[PDB]
Amino acid sequence: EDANERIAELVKLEERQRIARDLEDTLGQKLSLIGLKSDLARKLIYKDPEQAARELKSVQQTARTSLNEVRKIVSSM
């Protein structure tokens, strides 16, 4: 029954490789951005708070759609 075993291992692997590329791209980028922007936002707490809040709503969105995306890369639908 190996015959099926080892071939199916090959397909998992491939599947694994695919997800891996997708993730790598989108996510590296999005996490760096979130770091950056959360830092600008900190820079404004005092000097311009309304701005800092908008920036934070932004960071919130990029984290949300980041989840979505991961979810999508691994979507079975």
Q: Which residues form the interface with a second copy (CB under 8 A)?
A: 2-3, 6-8, 10-17, 19-21, 23-24, 27-28, 31-32, 34-35, 38-39, 41-42, 45-46, 49, 52-53, 56-57, 59-60, 63-64, 66-67, 70-71, 73-74, 76-77
DSSP codes, 7-46: HHHHHHHHHHHHHHHHHHHHHHHHHHHHHHHHHHHHHHTT
Cβ at position 20, least distance to a second copy in Å: 4
Two tokens, residue 23: 């993730």
Cβ at position 74, least distance to a second copy in Å: 4
